Amino acid sequence: VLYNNADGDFAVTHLTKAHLFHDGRVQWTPPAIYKSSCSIDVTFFPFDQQNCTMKFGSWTYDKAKIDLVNMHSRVDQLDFWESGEWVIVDAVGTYN
Amino acid sequence: VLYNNADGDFAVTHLTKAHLFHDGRVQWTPPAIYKSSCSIDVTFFPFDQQNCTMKFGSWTYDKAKIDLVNMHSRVDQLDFWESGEWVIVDAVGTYNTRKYECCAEIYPDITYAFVIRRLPLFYTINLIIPCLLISCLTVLVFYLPSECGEKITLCISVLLSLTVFLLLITEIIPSTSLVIPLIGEYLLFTMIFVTLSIVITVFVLNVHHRSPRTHTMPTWVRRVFLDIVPRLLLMKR
Amino acid sequence: SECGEKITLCISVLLSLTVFLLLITEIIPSTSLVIPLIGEYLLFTMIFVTLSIVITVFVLNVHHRSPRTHTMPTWVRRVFLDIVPRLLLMKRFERSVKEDWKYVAMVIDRIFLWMFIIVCLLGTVGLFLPPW
Amino acid sequence: TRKYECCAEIYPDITYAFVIRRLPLFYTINLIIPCLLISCLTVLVFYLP
Amino acid sequence: VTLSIVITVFVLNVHHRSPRTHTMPTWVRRVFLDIVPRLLLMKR
Amino acid sequence: PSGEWDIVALPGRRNENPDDSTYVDITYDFIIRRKPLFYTINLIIPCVLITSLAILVFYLPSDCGEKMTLCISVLLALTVFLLLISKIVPPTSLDVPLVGKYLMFTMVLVTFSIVTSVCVLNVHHRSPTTHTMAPWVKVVFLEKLPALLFMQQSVSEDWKYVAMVIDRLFLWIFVFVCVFGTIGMF
C-alpha cells in the first residue's frame, strides 16, 4: 500500500491474474490509478520543476519477515504516453 | 463509528490485517478517509482559528459490555504532513458518556477537538491588500477639480470594483447567518460611503455648471459661502 | 492633461491588473509557504500604479486651478521655473498666469515621469535574476 | 422489429418517444428580455449630437 | 452595431475637420444643401 | 444546530389511499426557514444601494456631458445582479422571485431613462442659428414653467433652459413613479 494517498484507493482493486512457474516462482502485474499528494513549490512559475514523492510498503509485515528489494534503480517508461503538458525529467527509487 | 459524518463512510471500510499475541492480545490499525462537518467560524478572516470536532464511539454496545480508554491523551503527529496552508495548534481527546432516548444504559464516546490556525500570508498578499488599496481612493475624488469632468467615472469605477470584491469574497466564506465576516462588513461600509460620495459629488457638479441667468439666488448663499472659507483656513481671491 | 482621460487610462490599467491577479490566484495553489514570482511582480505594479493615480489626480488639480483662487506665485516661480533648465527642457494678463500654471503642471508631470520610468526599469530587471 | 448483421433472425424492440416542452418563464425573464431590451440602443447613437 | 460604430467614427471625423485642412466645398455644397428639403428638415 | 437554516416543526403523517387498498406510507414534512441576515447583507444591500442612481442621474447637468457614462454603468450593474440572482435561484419557471421582478422593472425604468437622456442631450446642444422653431415652443414652455414651481429667468441659453426644464419634469415624474414602485414591493 502507499502512505501518501488523498481520497483514493489504498490498494489495487482490479486483482488481475498472476503467473506461476514450476519452480515455485510467481509474478503479478496489476494496473492501478493512484492519487498522490505533492509538495507543490511554485516560485519559478511557470518555468517550474515539480518534485513528487510516492511511498510504497507493506502494512502489517515487519522487516523481520518481508524484505523489499528494488529491481530497477529507475522507473521503466517503455509504455509511456506523451501527455503534452509534462515531461518526466527523471524518476529515482530509494530503499529506506 | 463516528456520529459526525457528512457524505462519507461511517465505519472503517478497508479491513486490513491485524496483529495477535500469544496471550490473546490483538492490535488493529486500519487507515481511512473521514469526512466530518465542523462549524467553520469565520469572523477574523483571514487571521482565523478553527475548532473542529470528531466524535467516535460504539454503536450497539453499552458501558456494561464495552468501555473505551484513550491510550494517548493527545493525537500523535510523528507522521504528519505539513499541508502548507494549515498548522495544528493542538488535538485533544476527551472521554465522555451520554444517555439517549432509545434506551436505558449510558453509552461512552471519545471526542477529538482539533484547534488549528490558518497561515495568513496568501490571502493577505492576494485578496485583502488589493481591496484595501482600492478602497483608499474613495476620498480622492473630491480633491479632483470640478471642471475637468471625469469625477463620476472614478466614482463608478471604485463602486464597481468594491462590488466585485464583495461578490468574490462571498464565495470563499460560508453563508452562515450566525455571524458576519469582518472584511465583508468593512467592504459594505466602504460601499455605503462611496455611494454617498457619488450622490454628493453629482450634487456639487450640478452646482458647478448652473448659469447666472437661470439660478441667480445671490442673497442667502453669498453671506455664508464667502465667510466660511476663513474658518476653513483657505485664502480668498 | 488637457485631453482629460488620464484617469480613465489609470483606472483601466489598475482594474485589468487586478483582474489578472485574481485570475492567477485560481491556478496557483493556495499555499502560504512561498509566494509566486508573478504574483509579487503584479502586486508591485499595482502599488506603483495606484501611486501613479494619486500623483496624477494631484497634478490634474494643479493644472485646472484658476489664477483668481490659488495664486501663490512667490515660492513657486523660484523653483518650478528653474528645474526646467536642469531637466533638459527648452523654455518658452490672466492668460499669462494660466499659461504659467499649465506649464508648471506639465513640468511636474515630466519630472515625475523620469523617476517613475527609472524605478520601473530598475524593479523589473533588478528583480528577475535568480537563474543568472 | 429489426435485423442486425450478426444473425439471421429478426429482433424485437420497443421505442418510447417522449415529446416534452420547456416552461419559458425563467429564460424569457432572465435571458432573452435583457438582450432584446439592450437591442433598443443600437439605433439610438445616431440621434445623439 | 459594428457598422454603426464605423459610420459614427466617420461622421465624428467629418464634424471636427477645420476649414483650413479639408476645404473641398464645391461638390459638397450642391449635394448636402439641397438634400435638406428631401429629408423634411428645416434650414437656418 | 445547523447554522444558516432553522427548523420550525416536523409533522409526520401516515398516508393511506383508500382506493388502491394496498398503498401505505409514512410522510414526514420539514418546514425550514432561512435566516435572512446573510443574503440581506450581501444581495439586497448592493441592489438598493445602486438602484437610487437610476433616478439620481437626471440631477446631473447636461453641459458636463456624462449622463451616458453613469446611465450605462447603472444598466450594466443591474444586468450583472440579474444574471447572478438568476444563477443562485433554482431554474423553475413556475414562479418568479420578487427581487428578480424588482430588478426587471427598474431595468426597464433605466432603459427608458437612457433614451430620455439622449433626447434631452440632443435638444440641449442645438445652436440658435439652425433650429430656431420659436413660436410653437416659447409660449408652451413659458406657460409650463410655473406648473413645476421653478424659478423664473442669446437663444442658446434659451435651449439650455428648455432642456433643464424638461429633464426636471422627467425627474419629478420619475421619482413620483419610483415611490409607487417601492410601495408596490410591500
Ligand SMILES: *[C@@H]1O[C@H](CO)[C@@H](O)[C@H](O)[C@H]1NC(C)=O
Ligand atoms: C526530491 O526530493 C527528494 C526527497 O527529499 C530528494 O531526495 C531529491 O533530492 C529531490 N529532487 C531534487 C532534484 O532535488
Ligand SMILES: *[C@@H]1O[C@H](CO)[C@@H](O)[C@H](O)[C@H]1NC(C)=O
Ligand atoms: C473547542 O470546542 C470544544 C467543544 O465545544 C471546547 O470544549 C473547547 O474549549 C474548544 N477549544 C478551545 C481552545 O476553546
Ligand SMILES: CN1CCC[C@H]1c1cccnc1
Ligand atoms: C507498521 N505499520 C506501518 C504503519 C502502521 C503500522 C501498523 C500498526 C499496527 C498494525 N498494522 C500496521
Ligand SMILES: CN1CCC[C@H]1c1cccnc1
Ligand atoms: C448507541 N447508538 C447510538 C444511537 C442509537 C444507539 C443504539 C442503541 C441500541 C442499538 N443500536 C444503537
